[PDB]
Amino acid sequence: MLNTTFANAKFANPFMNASGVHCMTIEDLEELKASQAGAYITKSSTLEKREGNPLPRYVDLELGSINSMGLPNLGFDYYLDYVLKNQKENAQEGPIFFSIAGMSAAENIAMLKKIQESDFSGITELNLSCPNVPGKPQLAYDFEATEKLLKEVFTFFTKPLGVKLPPYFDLVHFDIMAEILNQFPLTYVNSVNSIGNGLFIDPEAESVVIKPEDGFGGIGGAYIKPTALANVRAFYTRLKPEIQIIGTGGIETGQDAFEHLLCGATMLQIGTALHKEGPAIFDRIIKELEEIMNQKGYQSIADFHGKLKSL
Amino acid sequence: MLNTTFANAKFANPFMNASGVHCMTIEDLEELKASQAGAYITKSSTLEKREGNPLPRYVDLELGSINSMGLPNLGFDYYLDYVLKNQKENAQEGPIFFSIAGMSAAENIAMLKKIQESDFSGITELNLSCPNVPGKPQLAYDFEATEKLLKEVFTFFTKPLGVKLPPYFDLVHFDIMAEILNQFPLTYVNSVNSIGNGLFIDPEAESVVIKPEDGFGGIGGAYIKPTALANVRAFYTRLKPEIQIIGTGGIETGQDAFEHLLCGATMLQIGTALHKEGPAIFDRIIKELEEIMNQKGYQSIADFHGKLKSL
Numbered sequence: 324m325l326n327t328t329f330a331n332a333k334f335a336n337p338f339m340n341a342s343g344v345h346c347m348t349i350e351d352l353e354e355l356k357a358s359q360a361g362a363y364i365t366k367s368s369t370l371e372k373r374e375g376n377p378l379p380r381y382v383d384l385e386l387g388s389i390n391s392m393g394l395p396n397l398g399f400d401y402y403l404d405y406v407l408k409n410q411k412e413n414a415q416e417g418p419i420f421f422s423i424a425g426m427s428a429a430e431n432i433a434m435l436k437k438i439q440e441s442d443f444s445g446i447t448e449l450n451l452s453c454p455n456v457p458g459k460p461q462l463a464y465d466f467e468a469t470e471k472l473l474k475e476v477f478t479f480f481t482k483p484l485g486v487k488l489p490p491y492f493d494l495v496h497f498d499i500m501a502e503i504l505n506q507f508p509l510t511y512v513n514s515v516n517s518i519g520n521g522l523f524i525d526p527e528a529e530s531v532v533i534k535p536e537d538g539f540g541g542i543g544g545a546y547i548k549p550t551a552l553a554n555v556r557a558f559y560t561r562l563k564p565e566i567q568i569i570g571t572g573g574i575e576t577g578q579d580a581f582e583h584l585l586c587g588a589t590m591l592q593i594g595t596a597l598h599k600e601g602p603a604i605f606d607r608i609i610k611e612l613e614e615i616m617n618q619k620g621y622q623s624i625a626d627f628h629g630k631l632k633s634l
Numbered sequence: 635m636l637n638t639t640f641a642n643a644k645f646a647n648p649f650m651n652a653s654g655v656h657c658m659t660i661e662d663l664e665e666l667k668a669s670q671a672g673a674y675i676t677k678s679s680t681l682e683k684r685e686g687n688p689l690p691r692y693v694d695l696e697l698g699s700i701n702s703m704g705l706p707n708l709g710f711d712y713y714l715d716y717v718l719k720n721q722k723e724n725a726q727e728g729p730i731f732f733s734i735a736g737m738s739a740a741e742n743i744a745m746l747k748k749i750q751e752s753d754f755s756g757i758t759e760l761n762l763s764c765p766n767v768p769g770k771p772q773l774a775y776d777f778e779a780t781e782k783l784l785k786e787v788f789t790f791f792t793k794p795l796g797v798k799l800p801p802y803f804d805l806v807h808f809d810i811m812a813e814i815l816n817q818f819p820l821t822y823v824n825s826v827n828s829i830g831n832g833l834f835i836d837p838e839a840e841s842v843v844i845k846p847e848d849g850f851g852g853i854g855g856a857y858i859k860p861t862a863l864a865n866v867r868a869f870y871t872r873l874k875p876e877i878q879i880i881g882t883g884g885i886e887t888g889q890d891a892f893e894h895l896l897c898g899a900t901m902l903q904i905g906t907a908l909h910k911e912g913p914a915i916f917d918r919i920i921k922e923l924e925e926i927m928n929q930k931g932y933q934s935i936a937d938f939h940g941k942l943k944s945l
């Protein structure tokens with residue numbers, strides 16, 4: 324019932340882990356491969372291995388989560404070597420996704436060049452929430468910087484490429500970004516990354532709950548579904564059909580998944596809920612979505628994909 | 635215990651309604667005057683009376699609310715006439731707040747000029763989430779446009795003035811805005827307005843819940859407290875002491891109020907929760923905050939104001 328076609332590949336279902344959750348090590352990845360997830364993505368990597376920020380840097384919240392991991396990862400070469408070896412085993416239907424988040428534009432270009440030159444036949448995801456010039460907003464909030472980077476990337480990168488974007492909150496911003504993205508042969512857009520720089524407080528202790536950035540961190544979970552759905556829908560109605568969408572943000576139940584698909588998302592990623600529940604979540608949410616579809620008499624995602632009704 | 639000093643005026647407590655909620659008519663305003671609210675603010679007005687968007691345009695949600703009211707209001711003259719007459723009765727400790735959200739820069743300047751010329755001795759709040767040039771983001775997301783407007787405003791406006799701002803999600807944005815705002819003799823900054831363009835879906839009906847903007851609307855309530863607290867705190871540590879802060883966003887319990895005050899807010903505004911509960915909320919939340927203070931042995935907000943601890 325959930326069979327999905329994305330980036331010209333076939334997947335058993337649309338579910339995937341969100342980058343950063345349960346995908347740090349080869350062991351994490353193997354557990355994802357073993358789960359019911361239709362596909363999985365690696366932790367955003369940088370050129371060098373990164374320890375990340377001081378703990379505590381992640382906290383479960385009643386309505387979601389807050390984090391400031393600091394891009395901890397085992398380095399580009401570690402992930403590239405892993406995906407290259409699994410690619411050869413052909414023991415998995417559907418390509419693996421490879422996320423990169425260079426500490427700089429030069430680092431992103433360098434990693435993209437290595438992926439291009441390698442035999443990697445999978446899908447690449449460029450995290451545009453990656454660092455940028457000192458007195459500059461995250462890359463994706465700097466429209467000029469974003470367009471400049473993408474133009475250089477597409478002068479040489481011919482393999483499947485998608486971009487992970489932060490949430491937008493103004494319709495003109497969606498228009499500007501859509502216009503920038505539509506000029507490129509992008510495989511997809513993934514909305515959204517966590518809601519940036521939120522703050523959570525322990526009232527009793529009268530203090531923040533994470534050590535880095537004075538307690539400020541990305542927000543995920545139920546807090547952000549309204550924003551995540553909006554971004555998925557806003558891009559669905561603005562992007563050229565060539566560019567598909569991956570919906571990410573506040574997905575925990577089959578109903579949440581149903582809502583993202585209704586908005587136009589083709590693949591779905593689970594972050595916070597997966598972090599709390601573990602790989603077993605995929606089997607649960609898959610069954611939940613199928614039950615919803617059964618009650619409505621739907622046999623394929625195509626029966627409702629992108630059919631969100633306006634009043 | 636909650637006595638507060640703000641904009642050089644004295645208030646029985648920091649609580650107020652958030653603009654747009656329970657402040658449309660003179661009758662609404664009188665009910666706010668009659669409640670325990672330490673102060674109140676009028677609905678953002680425009681030069682002409684506005685009917686607002688088609689219904690349904692506001693919906694209560696389990697975790698907050700979504701709206702696209704479309705600035706319905708009775709017109710500038712109606713509100714100005716009201717506050718001028720109440721000002722004379724001296725039957726209220728602390729000035730009334732007057733919100734304006736011109737459909738254009740010319741409209742904001744025109745209203746500010748009328749307030750300046752009038753005998754209004756209260757406080758004015760400029761809603762920088764007001765409309766802007768066609769292909770331009772809301773005013774407050776257009777740093778250049780915002781600075782230009784404020785410079786013109788301060789070439790003539792000498793009365794107390796505060797600005798209502800939308801939420802920001804990047805630290806560099808807070809730096810840029812703080813730098814722009816610190817150059818003016820502003821009375822205060824009010825963070826935050828609703829999280830813009832969120833989307834809520836009724837999965838059974840497979841449709842949005844508000845009629846305008848294809849269902850997209852500002853999000854308020856529990857969904858946004860993490861973002862609201864972050865904005866209050868981020869500005870508290872960047873604004874010159876001359877500019878105080880009004881905390882708005884996800885305030886429903888004494889604990890929520892405690893958190894905003896801990897961040898640096900001096901006055902507090904309640905939107906969503908007030909819309910659901912009615913003016914009686916002020917008596918409840920006041921008691922809730924006082925109980926929290928009593929348990930901690932605090933006798934004045936000064937005992938913890940802005941004392942949020944980092945790890």
Ligand SMILES: Cc1cc2nc3c(=O)[nH]c(=O)nc-3n(C[C@H](O)[C@H](O)[C@H](O)COP(=O)(O)O)c2cc1C
Nearest residue numbers: 341342343367515516517543544572573593594595
């Ligand atoms: C602990 C943690 C680490 C994350 N790491 C990444 C990362 O390396 N790259 C990326 O693009 N997104 C990262 N994200 C963001 C997620 O991919 C996802 O966009 C976010 O958590 C919103 O989804 P959710 O509501 O299901 O959590 C991370 C989120 C969390 C909570």
Ligand SMILES: Cc1cc2nc3c(=O)[nH]c(=O)nc-3n(C[C@H](O)[C@H](O)[C@H](O)COP(=O)(O)O)c2cc1C
Nearest residue numbers: 652653654678826827828854855883884904905906
């Ligand atoms: C129905 C409604 C109308 C609103 N109207 C205004 C308005 O005219 N001007 C303004 O500055 N903010 C307006 N707001 C935003 C609030 O003042 C407040 O910033 C927002 O609801 C976030 O607070 P909350 O979490 O307590 O709801 C409105 C919010 C709602 C729900």
Ligand SMILES: O=C(O)c1cc(=O)[nH]c(=O)[nH]1
Nearest residue numbers: 391392393394452517541
């Ligand atoms: O590694 C992290 O801290 C991180 C990266 C990213 O893109 N998003 C997030 O929420 N955390």
Ligand SMILES: O=C(O)c1cc(=O)[nH]c(=O)[nH]1
Nearest residue numbers: 702703704705763828852
């Ligand atoms: O009147 C409205 O629609 C409105 C104005 C504003 O500033 N904020 C909001 O959430 N709604």
Ligand SMILES: [Mg+2]
Nearest residue numbers: 356357358359
């Ligand atoms: Mg599997």
Ligand SMILES: [Mg+2]
Nearest residue numbers: 667668669670
């Ligand atoms: Mg009163």
